[PDB]
RNA sequence: AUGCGCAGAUACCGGGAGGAACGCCGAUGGCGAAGGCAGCCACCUGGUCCACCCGUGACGCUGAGGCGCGAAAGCGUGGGGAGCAAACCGGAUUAGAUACCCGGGUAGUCCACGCCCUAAACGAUGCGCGCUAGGUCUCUGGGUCUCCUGGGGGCCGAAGCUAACGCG
């Protein structure tokens, strides 16, 4: 696995059981609001899964672009 | 849906003796009940062949157990038949 | 009755007496169905990361509560009803899972 | 002429012809150029070369109006989108910021044999 | 009080493919209704083929609502008339009096609905276009206010609300077209009540058709003494003409008809 | 070529409608008799994994026959077709091109209820149990969780099995 950034240690004790976590959630957005991967959250099957689910819940009702015009390119 | 409480209550009404935390009696009570509200659902739906299927297997199971019920003793058994209603 | 969290966003360009009439509708409806709060919350108005409702912001209401299970669907529909309901969302009431401990 | 110093430069490209255009700050445009704009036909128009050229035009015209500062809009990819964009920064005429779109699908409409061979 | 469509008699000799329908209100209509003369002959010269009759009731129905623009009404219930392509609801107005009215999408006996100055956009009530929640459905609809429910989409489940402009809203009408009506005008909310009817199947023609009332039509009927087209032989003629000194069947009719451009466009066609 | 555009298109901006699909995440990953099944939410539901050892008391393994189940194609009526698209129509082709390429466009593709059961239906390998090194990885349930243990997936893999692969 590649290592120079990583995020599993960006925030500690985080309840995946949410959606209204603008901040933390954001912490996996990258540019075009992708979903910053195992490749970064280094979060077990359990993790990518549920964490993901909420990522979902999140774009769902909203308040997070689930992709977005990238400014930079 | 699956109402654990009342559940136990009937496991009780049946299990002749209050110490039947798993007996033919209960296999009965249970597979029955389930089978029934379950099936009723099946009706107002029409397409879940997968679960229909399972239900199938299940009903089988239960009936067969009863099979043995008779095998050793159908007496107390017919009583059961009775109490319940199924197979008439 | 079980309990789910009621997360639902309602129009931004609202106002006074309006906030009044439709949020209360919220109310008595809820009750009529079998709702009755447990957590009367909301975080007020807020923006989003994507212009939905043809807007960049709206009002968001969150009340978690007890209700008659299945009714969910039902009231839900009753809600989305009121136009402005930019988003009508209900979820089974769970909350545990400490990742990174 | 309308004149408004800054706007957007749209660079969109196929792979046998590419295109660029000057648009105001909001979204309309004024002038442009492309593969076959560049006294070109068939292939060719799909050369980072032409890319460079029409870029060029887009430019001379560009100055020709009250503009020269611009954000670059990215649409698709061009066979030489670079020689193109470079011709762009090149005539400078201002070489501002750049936006990323080339607005992805998301899966909803099987293509034509062409990218069906892409199971 | 809805109605079964499909019941079909079976092999009672060639009485085959006969489709029944049965509204359940079954009550015999009520107090408000006269009858029609025996037209087919008219202004006392005689005209247009088929035509025969068969028993006799004959209707009076409401075509105008702004006449109480409010008194809730509750479905008196379902029923119909020896006319109309899609049954009716005899409705009761809370003020005592009642009225035979449409019969939109399967509403419900006793249901309250009404209309006027703001009616709840619930199929059943009716409203001045304007209260048009664009993208919704109605029928009955009338352009040129007051000119009564003009465009009685028979069983015509067809008034599709399509955007607005000026003092006119756009509509997709049966036909497969879009016209305009000044908003203040009006629409019966929702849609029709019958269609399957439209599919109905009837046995030994003579029997059915006639029962319908209508007898016949018989083109280039040999002896073309008249029958526009040829005859006095097998062979189907050529010229390309129809009965009573006709233009075939692929030519206009409209004109300046100030009518036309005045609204609507889509021009006349569909493509199922 | 072509077909479409100065009766202005192709690009850029805004708005409209609808059908389909469902990105990253999402995997060499998961659930299912099979088929095959995914944006989230909620309704009802079924298989099924671990631990206390509490219950019953071997009732169980097998399944000819039947009975229900299910690819995609296609039919039946009633919806619907944004795109894709046999058929068809062109354009490009060779000597020929009915096909491989480009330009078109139906049926169908999609939804409901009914109907066909169809097969490189596959791991080309029936099911049920118990006996015989280990090594590795990966998901998942319990713990004294340098690991161990029940379960579940690919990989290496003694013995051994086969005409040979290769199973292991």
From Swiss-Prot, chain B:
Stored Gene3D superfamilies: 6.10.250.3130, S15/NS1, RNA-binding (1.10.287.10)
Coiled-coil residue windows: none
A Gene Ontology BP annotation from the UniProt entry: translation
CC per GO annotation: cytosolic small ribosomal subunit
Keywords: Ribonucleoprotein, Ribosomal protein, RNA-binding, rRNA-binding
SUPFAM superfamilies: S15/NS1 RNA-binding domain
GO MF: rRNA binding; structural constituent of ribosome
Keyword RNA-binding belongs to the record: yes
Entry-linked Pfam families: Ribosomal_S15 (PF00312)
UniProt KW Cytoplasm keyword: no
CDD domains: Ribosomal_S15p_S13e
The family this protein is said to belong to: Belongs to the universal ribosomal protein uS15 family.
Subunit record text: Part of the 30S ribosomal subunit. Forms a bridge to the 50S subunit in the 70S ribosome, contacting the 23S rRNA.
Function, as annotated: One of the primary rRNA binding proteins, it binds directly to 16S rRNA where it helps nucleate assembly of the platform of the 30S subunit by binding and bridging several RNA helices of the 16S rRNA.
Protein name stated in the entry: Small ribosomal subunit protein uS15
Taxon lineage: Bacteria, Thermotogati, Deinococcota, Deinococci, Thermales
Protein's gene: rpsO
Swiss-Prot record, chain C:
Molecular-function GO terms, alphabetical: small ribosomal subunit rRNA binding; structural constituent of ribosome
CDD domains named among the record's database cross-references: bS6
GO CC terms: cytoplasm; ribonucleoprotein complex; ribosome
Keyword entries, A-Z: Ribonucleoprotein, Ribosomal protein, RNA-binding, rRNA-binding
UniProt cross-references to InterPro entries, sorted A to Z: Ribosomal_bS6, Ribosomal_bS6_CS, Ribosomal_bS6_sf, Ribosomal_S6_plastid/chlpt, Transl_elong_EF1B/ribsomal_bS6
UniProt superkingdom: Bacteria
A single GO BP: translation
Family annotation (NCBIfam families): S6
The family this protein is said to belong to: Belongs to the bacterial ribosomal protein bS6 family.
HAMAP family named in the record: Ribosomal_bS6
Subunit structure: Part of the 30S ribosomal subunit. Forms a tight heterodimer with protein bS18. May make transient contacts with protein uL2 of the 50S subunit during translation.
Function: Located on the outer edge of the platform on the body of the 30S subunit.
Descriptive protein name: Small ribosomal subunit protein bS6
Gene: rpsF
Swiss-Prot record, chain D:
GO cellular component: ribonucleoprotein complex; ribosome
Basic residues: bias regions: 109-119
Keywords: Ribonucleoprotein, Ribosomal protein, RNA-binding, rRNA-binding
Record InterPro entries: Ribosomal_uS11, Ribosomal_uS11_bac-type, Ribosomal_uS11_CS, Ribosomal_uS11_sf
Segments forming a coiled coil: none
Keyword Transcription: no
GO biological process: translation
Record NCBIfam families: PRK05309.1 (NF003698), uS11_bact (TIGR03632)
Function: Located on the upper part of the platform of the 30S subunit, where it bridges several disparate RNA helices of the 16S rRNA. Forms part of the Shine-Dalgarno cleft in the 70S ribosome, where it interacts both with the Shine-Dalgarno helix and mRNA.
Family: Belongs to the universal ribosomal protein uS11 family.
Protein name (record): Small ribosomal subunit protein uS11
Species: Thermus thermophilus (strain ATCC 27634 / DSM 579 / HB8)
From Swiss-Prot, chain E:
Biased composition (Basic and acidic residues): 226-236
Cellular component GO terms, alphabetical: large ribosomal subunit
InterPro entries in UniProt: NA-bd_OB-fold, Rib_uL2_dom2, Ribosomal_uL2, Ribosomal_uL2_bac/org-type, Ribosomal_uL2_C, Ribosomal_uL2_CS, Ribosomal_uL2_dom3, Ribosomal_uL2_RNA-bd_dom
Keywords for this protein: Ribonucleoprotein, Ribosomal protein, RNA-binding, rRNA-binding
Basic residues composition-biased segments: 253-272
Pfam families (alphabetical): Ribosomal_L2 (PF00181), Ribosomal_L2_C (PF03947)
Presence of the UniProt keyword tRNA-binding in the record: no
Iron as UniProt keyword: no
SUPFAM superfamilies given in the database record: Nucleic acid-binding proteins (SSF50249), Translation proteins SH3-like domain (SSF50104)
Entry function: One of the primary rRNA binding proteins. Required for association of the 30S and 50S subunits to form the 70S ribosome, for tRNA binding and peptide bond formation. It has been suggested to have peptidyltransferase activity; this is somewhat controversial. Makes several contacts with the 16S rRNA in the 70S ribosome.
Protein name: Large ribosomal subunit protein uL2
Organism classification: Bacteria, Thermotogati, Deinococcota, Deinococci, Thermales
């Amino acid at each position: 696995p590649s290592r120079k950034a990583k995020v599993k240690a960006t925030l500690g004790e985080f309840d995946l059981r949410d959606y209204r976590n603008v901040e933390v959630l954001k912490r996996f957005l990258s540019e075009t609001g992708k979903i910053l991967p195992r490749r970064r959250t280094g979060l077990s099957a359990k993790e990518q899964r549920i964490l993901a689910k909420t990522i979902k819940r999140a774009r769902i009702l909203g308040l997070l672009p689930f992709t977005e015009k990238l400014v930079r390119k | 849906p699956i109402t654990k409480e009342e559940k136990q209550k009937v496991i009780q009404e049946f299990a002749r003796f209050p110490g039947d935390t798993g007996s033919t009696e209960v296999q009965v009570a249970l597979l029955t009940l389930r089978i029934n509200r379950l099936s009723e659902h099946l009706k107002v739906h029409k397409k879940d062949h997968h679960s229909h299927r399972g239900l199938l297997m299940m009903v089988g199971q239960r009936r067969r157990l009863l099979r043995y019920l008779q095998r050793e003793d159908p007496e107390r058994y017919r009583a059961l038949i009775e109490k319940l209603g199924i197979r008439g | 009755m079980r309990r789910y969290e009621v997360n639902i966003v309602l129009n931004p360009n609202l106002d006074q007496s309006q906030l009044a009439l439709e949020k209360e509708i919220i109310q008595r409806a809820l009750e009529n169905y079998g709702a009755r709060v447990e957590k009367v919350e909301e975080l007020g108005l807020r923006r989003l990361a994507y212009p939905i409702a043809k807007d960049p912001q709206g009002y968001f209401l969150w009340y978690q509560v007890e209700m008659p299970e299945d009714r969910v669907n039902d009231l839900a529909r009753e809600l989305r009803i009121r136009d402005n309901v930019r988003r009508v969302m209900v979820v089974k009431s769970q909350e545990p899972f400490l990742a990174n401990a | 002429k309308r004149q408004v110093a800054s706007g957007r430069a749209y660079i969109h490209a196929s792979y046998n012809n590419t295109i660029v255009t000057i648009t105001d700050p909001d979204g309309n445009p004024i002038t442009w150029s492309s593969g076959g704009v560049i006294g070109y036909k068939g292939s060719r128009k799909g050369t980072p070369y032409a890319a460079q050229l029409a870029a060029l035009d887009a430019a001379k015209k560009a100055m020709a109006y009250g503009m020269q500062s611009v954000d670059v809009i990215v649409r698709g990819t061009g066979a030489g989108r670079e020689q193109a964009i470079r011709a762009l920064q090149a005539s400078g005429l201002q070489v501002k910021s750049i936006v990323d779109d080339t607005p992805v699908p998301h899966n909803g409409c099987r293509p034509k044999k062409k990218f069906r061979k892409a199971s | 009080k809805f109605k079964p469509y499909t019941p079909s008699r079976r092999f009672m000799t060639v009485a085959d493919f006969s489709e029944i329908t049965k509204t359940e209100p079954e009550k015999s209509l009520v107090k408000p209704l006269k009858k029609t003369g025996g037209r087919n002959n008219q202004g006392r010269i005689t005209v247009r083929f088929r035509g025969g009759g068969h028993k006799r009731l004959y209707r009076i129905i409401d075509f105008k609502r702004w006449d109480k623009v409010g008194i809730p009404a509750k479905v008196a219930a379902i029923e119909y008339d020896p006319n109309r392509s899609a049954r009716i609801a005899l409705l009761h107005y809370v003020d005592g009096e009642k009225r035979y009215i449409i019969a939109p999408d399967g509403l419900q006996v006793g249901q309250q609905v009404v209309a006027g100055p703001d009616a709840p956009i619930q199929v059943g009530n009716a409203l001045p276009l304007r209260f048009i929640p664009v993208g919704t459905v109605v029928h009955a609809v009338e352009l040129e206010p007051k000119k009564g429910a003009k465009l009685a989409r028979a069983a015509g489940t067809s008034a599709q609300i399509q955007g607005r402009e000026g003092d006119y809203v756009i509509l997709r009408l049966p036909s497969g077209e879009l016209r305009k009506v000044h908003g203040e005008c009006y629409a019966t909310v929702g849609a029709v009540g019958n269609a399957d009817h439209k599919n109905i199947v009837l046995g030994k023609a003579g029997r059915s058709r006639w029962l319908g009332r209508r007898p016949h039509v018989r083109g280039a009927a040999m002896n073309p003494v008249d029958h526009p087209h040829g005859g006095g032989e097998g062979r189907a003629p050529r010229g390309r003409p129809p009965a009573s000194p006709w233009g075939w069947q692929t030519k206009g009719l409209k004109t300046r008809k100030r009518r036309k451009p005045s609204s609507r466009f889509i021009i006349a066609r569909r493509k199922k």
